[PDB]
Assembly symmetry: C2
Homo-oligomer: 210 residues x 2
């Protein structure tokens, strides 16, 4: 009653945009580690039951088309939708490899109206980007685009590490907010700066199980 | 599903915390803002509600911008050492990143900054809750841990402060808190409020909290 009905054929689709090499004409160097993060995320989410697909070095066109096309799909037997973005970011904007595109435009497509099939179902956006308020949307930022998010060349971001670890072990028993909160604490505890940020328009508790 | 974890905010303190409610109903003509009929009804339900949770609630009304800033700053300079948390509720007119005082408009972000870890070390590691009902996204928020923002309406749209029933968000918040304030976790309460408000406009919660928040046991 107080939970999102997960009784569906599929858990849902999980698009993982992984931008690592940005065209010079943007002024943003390679994101060594995003490859580590991504693989981690791929497993973690595939493990939750998502039909996950990874897209590398996407342009603002590719990224917009991707999200556009996905929203257009039929999500009837889908429990929800998940999108994970990994790249450079600024004021509410995400970096393509050839420029910058506004996050709002990526989520726009899945709004209640533009995507009848996902209506009433959770839309999840996990955004990791160092430098659209509609119901049932949830955003989880590695940290605001302005403040820097700590990585580790061959170890990946703390956020992603924490998120995959927590999800790996509790992705089945904790509610989505509990997990993200632990991710919050864990990322936070690293410094002892950066604190992830969760924005939730969810109307029911979210559980990737039963 | 819910149980015994070091994943809960330590609530074992002398007192629960202070709860500041700013009830701006009347605004200076020059601001062009109208009377917020129904705000007193929210203010009353809110004060009773939080008083009931164990908060030491203080209610200010028709405050000026200078007043709001001063009040919150002073609140941040007090010694919250024996308090478990801190709550501030703003009921007024709103606009992108700003909230109205009677004499004008001031940035929500500055109002909340007063409590950042480095400026209110006595609330450090302690949840700082802001419930904002600014009629009329992470941006108008401090980059600090243990902060929680529950925005009344769409930080892009307008909430419907009912003529003489009280804003939908507020009333829903109080309703759910009366009922489960002492048995549900903060995100559970607000998520239900979200649903409730939506079953009528969608409120949004920004959480930087690092632990679960239970007001009791």
């Amino acid at each position: 009653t107080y939970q999102y009905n997960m009784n569906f054929e599929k858990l849902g689709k999980c698009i993982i945009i992984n931008n690592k090499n940005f065209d010079k004409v943007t002024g943003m160097g390679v994101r060594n580690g995003t490859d580590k993060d991504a693989e981690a995320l791929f497993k973690c989410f595939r493990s939750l039951g998502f039909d996950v697909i990874v897209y590398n070095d996407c342009s603002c066109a590719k990224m917009q088309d991707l999200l556009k096309k996905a929203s257009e799909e039929d999500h009837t037997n889908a429990a929800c939708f998940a999108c994970i973005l990994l790249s450079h970011g600024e004021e509410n904007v995400i970096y393509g490899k050839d420029g910058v595109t506004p996050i709002k435009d990526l989520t726009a497509h899945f709004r209640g109206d533009r995507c009848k099939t996902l209506l009433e179902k959770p839309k999840l956006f996990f955004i990791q980007a160092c430098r659209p308020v509609e119901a049932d949307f949830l955003f989880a930022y590695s940290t605001v685009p302005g403040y820097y998010s700590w990585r580790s060349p061959g170890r990946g971001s703390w956020f992603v590490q924490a998120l995959c670890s927590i999800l790996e072990e509790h992705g089945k028993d904790l509610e989505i907010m509990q997990i993200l909160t632990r991710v919050n604490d864990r990322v936070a505890r690293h410094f002892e700066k950066q604190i992830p940020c969760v924005v939730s328009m969810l109307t029911k508790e979210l559980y990737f199980s039963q």
